[PDB]
Amino acid sequence: NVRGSGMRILVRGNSPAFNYNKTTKRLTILGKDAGTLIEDPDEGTSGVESAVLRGFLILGKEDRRYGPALSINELSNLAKGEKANVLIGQGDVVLVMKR
Amino acid sequence: MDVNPTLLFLKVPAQNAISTTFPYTGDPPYSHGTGTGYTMDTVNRTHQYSEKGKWTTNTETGAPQLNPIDGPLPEDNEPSGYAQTDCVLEAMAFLEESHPGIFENSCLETMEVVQQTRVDRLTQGRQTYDWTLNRNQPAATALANTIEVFRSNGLTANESGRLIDFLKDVMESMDKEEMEITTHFQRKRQRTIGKKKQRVNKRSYLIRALTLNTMTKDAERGKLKRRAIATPGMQIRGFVYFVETLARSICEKLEQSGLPVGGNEKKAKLANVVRKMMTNSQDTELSFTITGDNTKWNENQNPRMFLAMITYITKNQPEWFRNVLSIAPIMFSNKMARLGKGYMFESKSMKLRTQIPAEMLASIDLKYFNESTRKKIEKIRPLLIDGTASLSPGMMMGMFNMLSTVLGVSILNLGQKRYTKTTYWWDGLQSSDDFALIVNAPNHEGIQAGVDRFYRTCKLVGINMSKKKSYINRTGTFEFTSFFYRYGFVANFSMELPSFGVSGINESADMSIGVTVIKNNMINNDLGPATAQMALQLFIKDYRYTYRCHRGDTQIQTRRSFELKKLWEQTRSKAGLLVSDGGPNLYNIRNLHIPEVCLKWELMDEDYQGRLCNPLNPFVSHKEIESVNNAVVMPAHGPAKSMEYDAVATTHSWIPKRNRSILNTSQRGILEDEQMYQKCCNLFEKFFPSSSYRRPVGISSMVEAMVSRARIDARIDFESGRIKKEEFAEIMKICSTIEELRRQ
Amino acid sequence: LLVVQALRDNLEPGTFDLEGLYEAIEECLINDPWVLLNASWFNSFLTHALR
Amino acid sequence: YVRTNGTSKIKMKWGMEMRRCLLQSLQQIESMIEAESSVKEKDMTKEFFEN
RNA sequence: GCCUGCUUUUG
RNA sequence: AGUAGAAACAAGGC
């Protein structure tokens, strides 16, 4: 809450309130610099994102085999080992996998 | 190593260094001669982009006028002035549907304003084209000459003092056969200066009342080529005043406008609007921002669409209101244009030069001109009537910006998702000839479709977008009127750079303005403290060199380096002297908000303090409260604004001298009128002191009120006070003789 | 410069007529040494950026 | 080196006040310094200019 | 010899 | 010549 208005911070990806430039490595909050961010060598550059969904991983980009793009609020139907497609973020489709 | 500053942009972003991309330390481009060519270009352009319409001949002017309204639909992405009535009215209707009561309330406010306001409101403004002289004059001069000719002819309703009566007069003056005017001359062999009467038939008066003056705009930042601009007359001024009042009242109630707000209000509104959009937008939705300019914005926009808009906004109002707001778009649909100074010709063999006025381009052989100009004249010759070209199908630069913004917001309001009937939508921000659009959709196909629909819905109204100068990125970064938003607005500081020198008003005023822009730029821009100290130092160097006021403990020979040394040696306390009298500078960040006299008032010597600050000085001139501590300054990328400076009235608060060229011209007799009027008004302020603080009111001649107050003050001051009997009798005798002079 | 910055910031930039922009830049490069040098610098910037 | 040249009132006026250039540069420099001083809560002129 | 050195500059 | 650059200056007016 900021001046009675709900600023939304996006879990997956950048936002106008929270954006990390990948070029000059500066972090930016609300138009104000908040420090240069350093390169951990253990940064998994594998395309996988395990901290976006609750009980699901993100294996990569979409594939047309596993059907159309399910949505965030209709994922409890799935079960163990059931890969699927999900549209999230700024209109971006991805593949996911349950644990 | 070879040096490249642009490579700095490989580490620092372009918005956090955009000040480097503004070359505002050098002289700006200027025009040198005539502006006839650019006038012709604009006329033939706006007749080109509206050419498939239909031609007609006015019965009153005899002029060929091109009507493109409800013309064919465009077939390519070139500019078009083919506007459609039904879609304009649908835009207005949906606007009122989404923001109900907007037109009613705005009309009520403007009705109050219409009923109360006065003719004196026309005195304040910019210059004005005077049909009485066929050139530009100040606003009050034009008003006065127009009123004089009216009263000389018979129109006298403006004696009421209201504006709407002056408008009734200018309307009633069009239904007269032979208007009469008076013209200045002067002859010397003995300088004889007089006047002569002449007549103006009805059609002549109409073309003079409907025409605009044109001239080229100097000191433009950001363009390779020069532009032409227009200046309207005195008769189209009250009507457009009321129209822009209505448009202001409307645009104030719209979250999309940017025109009636300035400075930080503008940026605040923009930022609040962007946040509101990004909050109403969804998280699964893709979002993009177009940074956009419109091409040929002032040529496509037609007054007939403005008349449609007016008649829809005055729906269910009194007919006098509907009829006093309908006259501006009429008079700007039958308008004309003066071409200008003309051209100049050259002969190398005989070694001579010549000038050619614009009022012979219809009656001149085209051998002299080059190809481009020959083509121009060839196209324009049909439209010439008495040295002025017909121009119906478009506006000119700098007028109806508010109502044009209303139309822009009307188009932006067609992206509410209950008017698109789909899953994409849009909104944005609009100022005249600049905009920022924000488009939302679940994919890139919807983004393209929304962009296409915006383009087409805007082409149905005559709004063309510059593809050459527009670009689309994701949300977070954009540009709007030289404001660079990067997740927040950003400071530039080079727009404000020509404001850091001597302003050229007087010593006190230039000093105060110089320190005040430094502290302002410390607040608003991001000028640091050390750089501000340096700015002080450099400003004081420029101040001293311009005004020839060096420290006094120096050996710099100027024309007043002797008086200042005598003042230096007389004076005991030298930290109390002003920089203009040869003293030091005690300014720093701590005390930039204090004038130069209060800063050093305990340090002054009493004799200097009493000489400098003396009301009997002959150098000071205060006339009216609206001009006491207020100066016109001329920024980069804007019009001449007015700056308030805190200062104390001293002997350094002088006025500089005048141009003095008008002595050599036929219109020399305006000086004598000015001089006599100033004598009379000065004497009136002697009798009535409040005449410069509060506007007087009355119907009597000035002499009547003057002699009356003389008698009253004489009586009241003799009864209990200073006046004896001799003075009483003598001044009553003088009053009697004044009566014998006025009444006979 | 600003659309290139939008590309470096990974903001998916786009245009409607880029050759018009180039034709408008090139319309001003005529005969001044300082301006041609700035243009040369801009070409070097595009070469070292855009990578 | 001998030459004929020419100038105008406005060109003189604007070359009579070139000291403003000193501000432009310096302003940008201080901005950069301040942009780091906000990050590391300390003044950074000494680090930049010496180290 | 006399007079002049911005007499026409959008928002 | 030179300044400059889509039209002007290289003094003008009576």
Swiss-Prot record, chain A:
Entire-sequence positions represented here: 639 to 737 of 759
Assembly with partners or alone: Influenza RNA polymerase is composed of three subunits: PB1, PB2 and PA. Interacts (via N-terminus) with PB1 (via C-terminus). Interacts with nucleoprotein NP (via N-terminus). Interacts (via N-terminus) with host MAVS (via N-terminus); this interaction inhibits host innate immune response.
Protein name according to UniProt: Polymerase basic protein 2
Organism encoding this protein: Influenza A virus (strain A/Northern Territory/60/1968 H3N2)
Purpose of the protein: Plays an essential role in transcription initiation and cap-stealing mechanism, in which cellular capped pre-mRNAs are used to generate primers for viral transcription. Recognizes and binds the 7-methylguanosine-containing cap of the target pre-RNA which is subsequently cleaved after 10-13 nucleotides by the viral protein PA. Plays a role in the initiation of the viral genome replication and modulates the activity of the ribonucleoprotein (RNP) complex.
Protein family according to the UniProt entry: Belongs to the influenza viruses PB2 family.
Chain coiled-coil ranges: none
Subcellular location: Virion; Host nucleus; Host mitochondrion
Organism domain of life: Viruses
Swiss-Prot record, chain B:
PROSITE patterns per record: RDRP_SSRNA_NEG_SEG
Domain RdRp catalytic: 274-471
Motif range (Nuclear localization signal): 191-204
Record PTM text: Phosphorylated by host PRKCA.
GO CC annotation, single: host cell cytoplasm
Superkingdom classification of source: Viruses
Record-listed E.C. numbers: 2.7.7.48
Alphabetically ordered keywords of this record: Eukaryotic host gene expression shutoff by virus, Eukaryotic host transcription shutoff by virus, Host cytoplasm, Host gene expression shutoff by virus, Host nucleus, Host-virus interaction, Inhibition of host RNA polymerase II by virus, Nucleotide-binding, Nucleotidyltransferase, Phosphoprotein, RNA-directed RNA polymerase, Transferase, Viral RNA replication, Viral transcription
Region annotated Promoter-binding site, chain positions: 237-244
Disulfide bonds: none
Gene3D superfamilies noted in UniProt: 6.10.140.720
Bias-annotated ranges (Polar residues): 55-64
Enzyme class: transferase
Catalytic activity: RNA(n) + a ribonucleoside 5'-triphosphate = RNA(n+1) + diphosphate
GO molecular function, a single term: RNA binding
Entry's localization field: Host nucleus; Host cytoplasm
GO BP: DNA-templated transcription; symbiont-mediated suppression of host gene expression; symbiont-mediated suppression of host mRNA transcription via inhibition of RNA polymerase II activity; viral RNA genome replication; viral transcription
Record region (Disordered): 50-82
Main location: host cell
Subunit: Influenza RNA polymerase is composed of three subunits: PB1, PB2 and PA. Interacts (via N-terminus) with PA (via C-terminus). Interacts (via C-terminus) with PB2 (via N-terminus); this interaction is essential for transcription initiation.
HAMAP family: INFV_RDRP
Family named by the database record: Belongs to the influenza viruses polymerase PB1 family.
The protein, known as: RNA-directed RNA polymerase catalytic subunit
Source organism per UniProt: Influenza A virus (strain A/Northern Territory/60/1968 H3N2) (Influenza A virus (strain NT60))
UniProtKB/Swiss-Prot annotation, chain D:
Post-translational modification: Phosphorylated on serines and threonines by host kinases, including human casein kinase II.
Subcellular location: Host cytoplasm; Host nucleus
Similarity field: Belongs to the influenza viruses PA family.
General function of this protein: Plays an essential role in viral RNA transcription and replication by forming the heterotrimeric polymerase complex together with PB1 and PB2 subunits. The complex transcribes viral mRNAs by using a unique mechanism called cap-snatching. It consists in the hijacking and cleavage of host capped pre-mRNAs. These short capped RNAs are then used as primers for viral mRNAs. The PB2 subunit is responsible for the binding of the 5' cap of cellular pre-mRNAs which are subsequently cleaved after 10-13 nucleotides by the PA subunit that carries the endonuclease activity.
Assembly information from the UniProt record: Influenza RNA polymerase is composed of three subunits: PB1, PB2 and PA. Interacts (via C-terminus) with PB1 (via N-terminus).
This protein's name: Polymerase acidic protein
Source organism of the structure: Influenza A virus (strain A/Northern Territory/60/1968 H3N2)
Gene name tied to this protein: PA
Residues of the whole record sequence present: 564 to 614 of 716
